[PDB]
Design an enzyme around this catalytic site. Structure first.
Site, short mmCIF file in Angstrom:
data_model
loop_
_atom_site.label_atom_id
_atom_site.label_comp_id
_atom_site.label_asym_id
_atom_site.label_seq_id
_atom_site.Cartn_x
_atom_site.Cartn_y
_atom_site.Cartn_z
CB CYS A 1 -0.93 0.01 1.22
SG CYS A 1 -1.79 1.56 1.45
CE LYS B 1 -10.89 -3.37 3.74
NZ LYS B 1 -11.66 -2.10 3.62
CB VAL C 1 -3.91 0.19 5.81
CG1 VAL C 1 -4.46 -0.93 6.65
CG2 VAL C 1 -3.76 -0.23 4.36
CD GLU D 1 -7.80 9.75 5.42
OE1 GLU D 1 -7.23 10.14 4.42
OE2 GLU D 1 -8.71 8.95 5.46
CB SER D 2 -1.25 8.12 4.52
OG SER D 2 -1.64 8.92 3.44
#
Ligand SMILES: N[C@@H](CCC(=O)N[C@@H](CS)C(=O)NCC(=O)O)C(=O)O
Ligand SMILES: N[C@@H](CCC(=O)N[C@@H](CS)C(=O)NCC(=O)O)C(=O)O
Lengths: 238, 238
Positions: free
Chosen positions: B29, B56, B69, B82-83
């Protein structure tokens, strides 16, 4: 009439004077209202240049390559665009009580709530494309789904505002779209989100919000012109 | 095999131990790679739980209502998703040299560059829907248009990286999508953006980037399975 917008053919403006910051805005833009709420909340001396978004000055793309408002320009000539970025910059660069919390987790929480909110602005877009009572029914359900996300935050926190009992950055970031619900005839979209409905009433009592609120009739005036790409929309009432 | 993902039916994990932070991730990811680059760059002790995104665990929605993720969980039980939010949180909450500048304007500049980049992740989406040589030609042009925005930043700054001569937050935030260009056969999309092409070479030399780079063959393996909703995609190679 000082508030009249600058459009195509207007002269590029001069430097921002020391001691002031400038916002390139439009009086009915909810993204720019974020920035203006923060300017007011923090007591930051500023000037405003409204941009005719239906008939833009060519020079405005030198302020923001995206050609959107809001934009900040300071006396050093620095340019900052994107509403959330402008608000965070103002909170960091100017004195007074912070609108964002110092604690890293609580700051992250405000940003996560902004993410929960983030589908709303585009829905106030779905609204434009709604042309009858069937579309309207579907539109209201879309708003209700997003508002439920926000209601859940207030339900667990049991606080008056989204960041606590004191109004803070996140409230000002989401407010402009709630301000416009009445005029859009979407105010029934909060009838199953009772804490959110109470939050709207608390927001209207806030001195900063109150000072910047636009009436339904005025926003209606703007919208009618805006929906036709009228060069006069941004200057409604002037 | 410790890296094997947790999926449907897996037991909810126990508390994060004091002194560590946990990331819920997936090895391929790009959003989660942002967070892992920051964890590595800052030398933050952590554990990893990979999530089977095609199958999941039900409990994962308790970690993030969006079911995406990356997610951070710390020993106090705090959850951050949230990255970009996770990366900013890590930079603020942990010691070491900052990846974000202290100066408010320069921080805003990094956020504006992220905005300039922000159409790219969805285009690595347009790529999935590209099914022939005509689509591919159109896809490359879409990437070239966005890369030009980024090239302009390097052209005026004349710095090695997007935030200066030292690698910083913004470089790590945009890197994962450039990492994958070769495998997507989009590496020719930077041939008319020479500074950006040189930036890619400098990034691959960075100790943190180098340590986390995935080979083309490995990403290819993942993609083939991912494009078919295979429950085994996330665990390719294990
Ligand atoms: N993502 C921007 C959105 C700003 C925006 O869309 N502003 C509108 C007016 S409310 C605009 O300038 N529109 C002109 C156009 O789209 O050309 C922000 O957060 O500032
Ligand atoms: N806006 C999110 C995007 C995260 C994201 O999309 N992650 C993907 C994997 S790379 C995911 O979890 N996908 C699962 C799904 O869409 O259900 C962020 O910045 O973290």
């Amino acid at each position: 009439e000082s508030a009249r917008s600058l459009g195509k053919g207007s002269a590029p403006p001069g430097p921002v004077p020391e001691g002031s910051i400038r916002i390139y805005s439009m009086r009915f833009c909810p993204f720019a209202e974020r920035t203006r709420l923060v300017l007011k909340a923090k007591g930051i001396r500023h000037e405003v240049i409204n941009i005719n978004l239906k008939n833009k000055p060519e020079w405005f793309f030198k302020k923001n390559p995206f050609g959107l408002v809001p934009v900040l320009e300071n006396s050093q000539g620095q340019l900052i665009y994107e509403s959330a970025i402008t608000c965070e910059y103002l909170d960091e660069a100017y004195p007074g009580k912070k609108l964002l919390p110092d604690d890293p987790y609580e700051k992250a929480c405000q940003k996560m709530i902004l993410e929960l909110f983030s589908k709303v602005p585009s829905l106030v877009g779905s609204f434009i494309r709604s042309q009858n009572k069937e579309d309207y029914a579907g539109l209201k359900e879309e708003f209700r789904k997003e508002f439920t996300k926000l209601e859940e935050v207030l339900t667990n926190k049991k606080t008056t505002f989204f960041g606590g009992n004191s109004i803070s950055m996140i409230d000002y970031l989401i407010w402009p779209w709630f301000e416009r619900l009445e005029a859009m005839k979407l105010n029934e979209c909060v009838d199953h989100t009772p804490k959110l409905k109470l939050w709207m009433a608390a927001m209207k009592e806030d001195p900063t919000v109150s000072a910047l609120l636009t009436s339904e009739k005025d926003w209606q005036g703007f919208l009618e012109l805006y929906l036709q790409n009228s060069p006069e929309a941004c200057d409604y009432g002037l």
